[PDB]
Design a protein around this ligand. Structure first.
Ligand SMILES: OC[C@H]1O[C@@H](O[C@H]2[C@H](O)[C@H](O)[C@H](O[C@H]3[C@H](O)[C@H](O)[C@H](O[C@H]4[C@H](O)[C@H](O)[C@H](O)O[C@@H]4CO)O[C@@H]3CO)O[C@@H]2CO)[C@@H](O)[C@@H](O)[C@@H]1O
Length: 309
């Protein structure tokens, strides 16, 4: 598989965002300033809590099918390939990694089968969209740490997705969880949220290597990145981390990350975390403490490295 030079887009979007021309502008800025050849459209449905069974993708937190199809078409019209990544959030704030139900089915309690039924139906709806728009890859799940043990249900879900979509299929595991998934044989690509510390890449890359070699498959970090924020380089996943603005720390993180993964041939690309739909003004970049890379010194590290591959 070719080296995926990718960037995540659209995580901030809601109903209506993908029609506006600000969205089309942001996408062109993203491609121009980073040299990304892939866009990872990251969307999120909602369930009430980590222990609810209804997954809701029709409410206004979610873009409508028509503006999504349009945004994808527009992306491909710019020479960008498209990975579609529908995951799920909780309305009470709980990280999806905690979505969980009892092992046994208990009378009157929510069950794994009820959740997976709602979640399968959600995935199939977007797998049909991925097929009609000829997306290159489709991500059936993201950081579902406590659900990953339910292997037969993930295998059932992947089969259901293949009925609608004939392209590449992967699953996005969380950091340090690459061997927590036992259904990699059923996917085409292995991927993880590579939020590893700036000073621990060697140990982590060596662990992941041995996990990948147990399987048939290419690997890439479908998510990776770092806020421009003091302390983030050691904990790049923690989006609510409290620390002063620090653009240089974000640039150091990307420099180190590309340097360490460039020597590893099984590391097959990136879906850098994120490029916002409603991008800030480049004048305010110097005071932005978010994952965004627009107008910041890390923007040039990514452009150069992606342009070197
Ligand atoms: O309700 C009120 C006010 O809030 C607005 O929304 C929130 C929302 O409540 C929630 O906090 C949401 O969280 C984010 C977070 O900002 C990060 O982007 C985070 O990211 C991670 C992602 O989940 C994956 O782990 C990925 O791999 O790594 C990312 C970085 O770690 O994603 C969280 C959601 O899962 O942020 C928004 C806005 O900040 C709106 O509801 C608005 O309506 C209302 O006025």
């Amino acid at each position: 598989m070719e080296f995926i030079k990718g960037f995540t887009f659209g995580w901030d979007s809601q109903k209506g965002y993908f029609k506006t021309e600000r969205a089309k502008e942001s996408l062109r800025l993203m491609q121009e300033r980073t040299a990304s050849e892939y866009v990872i459209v990251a969307l999120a449905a909602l369930q009430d809590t980590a222990h609810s069974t209804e997954v809701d993708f029709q409410g206004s937190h979610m873009v409508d099918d028509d503006e999504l199809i349009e945004l994808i078409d527009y992306a491909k019209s710019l020479g960008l390939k498209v990975i579609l990544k529908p995951t799920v959030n909780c309305r009470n704030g709980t990280w999806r990694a905690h979505i969980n139900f009892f092992d046994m089915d208990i009378p009157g309690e929510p069950t794994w089968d009820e959740w997976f039924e709602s979640y399968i139906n959600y995935q199939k709806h977007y797998a049909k969209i991925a097929e009609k728009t000829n997306c290159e890859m489709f991500v059936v799940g993201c950081e579902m740490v406590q659900a990953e043990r339910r292997e037969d249900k993930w295998r059932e879900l992947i089969a259901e997705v293949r009925k609608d979509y004939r392209g590449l299929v992967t699953y996005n595991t969380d950091k340090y969880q690459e061997d927590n998934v036992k259904f990699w044989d059923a996917l085409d690509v292995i991927s993880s949220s590579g939020y590893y510390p700036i000073n621990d890449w060697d140990r982590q890359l060596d662990r992941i290597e041995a996990v990948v070699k147990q399987y048939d498959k290419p690997f890439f970090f479908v998510a990776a990145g770092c806020p421009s924020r003091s302390g983030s380089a050691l904990l790049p996943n923690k989006w609510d981390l409290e620390g002063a603005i620090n653009l240089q720390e974000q640039a150091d993180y990307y420099q180190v990350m590309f340097e360490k993964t460039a020597s590893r041939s099984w590391v097959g690309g990136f879906g850098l975390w994120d490029w916002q739909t409603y991008l800030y003004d480049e004048k305010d970049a110097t005071k932005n403490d978010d994952y965004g890379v627009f107008g910041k010194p890390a923007e040039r590290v990514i452009k150069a490295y992606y342009q070197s591959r």
